[PDB]
Amino acid sequence: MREIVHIQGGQCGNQIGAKFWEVISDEHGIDPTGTYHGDSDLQLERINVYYNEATGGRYVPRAILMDLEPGTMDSVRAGPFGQLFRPDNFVFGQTGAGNNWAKGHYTEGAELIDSVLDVVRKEAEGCDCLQGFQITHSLGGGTGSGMGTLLISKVREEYPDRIMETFSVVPSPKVSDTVVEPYNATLSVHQLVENADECMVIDNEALYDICFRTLKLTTPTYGDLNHLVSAAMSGVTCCLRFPGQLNSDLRKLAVNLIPFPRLHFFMIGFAPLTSRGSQQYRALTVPELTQQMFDAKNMMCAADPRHGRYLTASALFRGRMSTKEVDEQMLNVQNKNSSYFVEWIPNNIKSSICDIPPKGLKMAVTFVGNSTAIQEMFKRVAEQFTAMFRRKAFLHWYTGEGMDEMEFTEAESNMNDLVSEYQQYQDATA
């Protein structure tokens, strides 16, 4: 009940969903043929949140996959658990955006998005009582970074009260794969800040320090990345799907996290992460877990959180625990690190408890932190974007189909204003 529809676009988002659906199917005990084979009765009480029921006793995900090139869709269909997806929900173009934000937002998007809007409207009206929408996409690619944002605007214009969640992958300068990343990144953030209720930033480089340092595995892969990110996204809504000591849903997090409407950009983290070779030495305890998600290393973002101060924090625990040492550690860490915590909002940590752990683990935690450190990504993006724009390099591609440099100037000014307004509260005093 209080269910959420899943929608994804772009290659990165499609790969993300390909593992998110697989992991959630494992959690609920669903085989690749869509027939239930679980053991606990709790696994089927709340199956309606993500699954619709069809004749013959099978389930289908309520996912909408959108893309501009059918190659990725054809590759993901043949993969494991690729048969769960309804063939109708697939929507794809025949040309592609070519990493051009103007192309993926203006010239063909208006023509293509009517069908996907119709199908998502059908899905939204079908469900009992809609809770919100969640989207996964990357800001470095044209088709994703444009289509996702335009769809966000359209969906918000239709459902002003429903909740909005986005998993946005941002391009860091250390691992850069396409030269035109700053342009569409700035253009996308301009639109995204205007409508998204929650955005969580994800960086490959942060993922990558995590995978080399904690797991200590020799050969990382995109599959391992998708696994980490999927576990992180499953943890946020596990408590919505399963009983717990202290239930807390997306609206709870929304009210408890954002002091002001425009500060809705977070970084997330998952725990515990250990190398398989050291799995036996480590002891799973609440203090160890809390130091573990509060480590700057495990953070999913390139920002260094000790360069600023936390606006607020939230932790979701999975497994059978008592609230005692949990709240005790929260108070303890807030006392110990008072310098990194802003003072005019006392007791700025949220705790949520869910009694069921993930399969294969006894304890798990997902941490969401709103801290002042996010400004550094936008700063570096601003420097790169202005270094590009001052020489007017790579501009005629964007200008050739209706977009003009006035929009780029407005996007840069708005993002810089966001940075300034965001750092304003960092040094604010009571």
């Binding site: 080399f212 700057a296 290393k297 390139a302 260094d304 000790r306």
Partner: protein, 49 residues
């Protein structure tokens, strides 16, 4: 009091291979090795009329 950079210095096992054979890279492509086959093979004759 540790940051993301400057923390990868610590040695763990032999996976430093992927990250540190180019620490002191001994410059690079600064040297000219165009048409240096002059030594391997034998040079063609060059005669006056």
């Amino acid at each position: 009091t540790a940051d993301r950079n400057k923390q990868a210095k610590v040695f763990q096992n032999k996976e430093l291979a992927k990250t540190n054979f180019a620490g002191k890279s001994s410059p690079g492509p600064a040297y000219d090795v165009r048409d240096t086959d002059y030594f391997t093979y034998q040079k063609a004759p060059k005669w006056k009329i």
